[PDB]
A paper describes a structure:
FtsZ is an assembling GTPase that plays a key role during bacterial cell division. This widely conserved protein polymerizes in the presence of GTP and metal cations into polar filaments that gather at the center of dividing cells to form a dynamic Z-ring. First, GTP hydrolysis only occurs within the filament, as the complete catalytic site is formed at the interface between adjacent FtsZ monomers. We report a dozen filament structures of the FtsZ core (residues 12 to 316) from the pathogen S. aureus, hereafter SaFtsZ, in complex with various GTP mimetics and metal ions.
BeF3− is a close chemical mimetic of phosphate that has been employed in mechanistic studies of G-proteins and tubulin as a reversibly binding analog of the GTP γ-phosphate, whose interaction with FtsZ has not been documented. An intricate network of solvent molecules surrounds BeF3− and Mg2+ ions and contributes to stabilize the interactions between adjacent monomers. The last two solvent molecules belong to an H-bond connected path where three additional waters (B3 to B5) bridge bottom residue R143 with the GDP α-phosphate and the backbone of top residues M292 and F294. This solvent shell is altered in a structure lacking Mg2+, where bridging waters B2 to B4 shift away from R143 by approximately 1 Å and BeF3− tilts away from the precatalytic water by 6°, likely weakening BeF3− binding. Moreover, relocation of waters B2 to B4 upon Mg2+ binding enables bridging of R143 with the nucleotide phosphates, which arises as a key event to position its positive charge to assist catalysis.
Residue numbers in the entry: 9 to 315
Write the structure that this text describes.
């Protein structure tokens, strides 16, 4: 019997913000690691493992938007990063691309994690257009470096947040919406691993779908009542915040959780939604959990890769 060790690693300011907000939100059986050059921001981290990188280079400051300093800082702290990762079966590396630390250090952190054997997933943002062309170009280089270092990558263009706010939505509320991409992906895997399903999925299936597979989608949908299975499946695949949609997916890990009322017909309807939206011929791994504590709720979890 196997129990996978999951770690979430924030790199740079945005990544550590995500870690802090996810710790605040509550999340267990997940080890959080905060990595930064910025000692002022790192001192306020709620993570149990904090690694200040690059102190001999930045004198305790951030990288001043220079990704070469973020990269050199992580390289110089390799053994501390290894020590913190050690034991991980899966590592999520979260970072905002475009600055100095995330852009340069997050690909090194991901490469270390993957070299150490962990299934390594990146979840990174691209800068808002209002931050300018140079920030966007630097971020794009970071994204390319992340792609080369991870098993699977989820990119959230921050400009998508402007599609989900009104003119008054607090910035911090918008940032929480972006955090949900990572939080729900992590929670989805943690739950899939921990619960025994009637058609049981496990971390070996996660590895098959996600190891060395490029772009990825991780989503969860919940619905009740009539058409619940179709609606939950549509929710799981339809986030407005992703660069990579479901269209073209080559591999899918799909789990449906419901109460004793979960019907075979509605499980097919949900699977068909995912198949059809993909518009592809796919390696689908389908699972089912019966949670008798549920009444009318259905939960669909999707991991899609291979575009
Ligand atoms: N969605 C989101 N984006 C962020 C957050 N913090 C920073 N960013 C974005 O991340 C980019 C890099 O900023 P930051 O992580 O502070 O730079 P670093 O510390 O030098 O890596 C910024 O240009 C923003 O686009 C955050 O909390 N949420
Ligand atoms: F704030 Be980052 F380190 F440029
Ligand atoms: K399981």
């Amino acid at each position: 019997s196997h129990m996978a060790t999951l770690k979430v690693i924030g790199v740079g300011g945005g990544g550590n913000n995500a870690v802090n907000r996810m710790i605040d939100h509550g999340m267990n059986n997940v080890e959080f690691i905060a990595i930064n050059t910025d000692g002022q921001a790192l001192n306020l981290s709620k993570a149990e493992s904090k690694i200040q990188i690059g102190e001999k280079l930045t004198r305790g400051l951030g990288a001043g938007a220079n990704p070469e300093i973020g990269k050199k800082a992580a390289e110089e702290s390799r053994e501390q990063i290894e020590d913190a990762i050690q034991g991980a079966d899966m590592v999520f590396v979260t970072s905002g691309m475009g600055g100095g630390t995330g852009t340069g250090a997050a690909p090194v952190v991901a490469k270390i994690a993957k070299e150490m054997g962990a299934l390594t997933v990146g979840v990174v943002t691209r800068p808002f257009s209002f931050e300018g062309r140079k920030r966007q170009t630097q971020a794009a280089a970071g994204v390319e470096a992340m792609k080369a270092a991870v098993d699977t990558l989820i990119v959230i263009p921050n400009d998508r947040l402007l599609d989900i706010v009104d003119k008054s939505t607090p910035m911090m509320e918008a940032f929480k919406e972006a955090d949900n991409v990572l939080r729900q992906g992590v929670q989805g895997i943690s739950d899939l691993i921990a619960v025994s399903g009637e058609v049981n999925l496990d971390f070996a299936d996660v590895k098959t779908i996600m190891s060395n597979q490029g772009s990825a989608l991780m989503g969860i949908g919940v619905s009740s009542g009539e058409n619940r299975a179709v609606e939950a499946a549509k929710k799981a695949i339809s986030s407005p915040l992703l660069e990579t949609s479901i269209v073209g997916a080559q591999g899918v890990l799909m789990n449906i959780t419901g109460g004793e009322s979960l019907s075979l017909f509605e499980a097919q309807e949900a699977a068909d939604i995912v198949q059809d939206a993909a518009d592809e011929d796919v390696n689908m791994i389908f699972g089912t959990v019966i949670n008798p504590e549920l009444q009318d709720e259905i939960v669909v979890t999707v991991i899609a890769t291979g575009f």
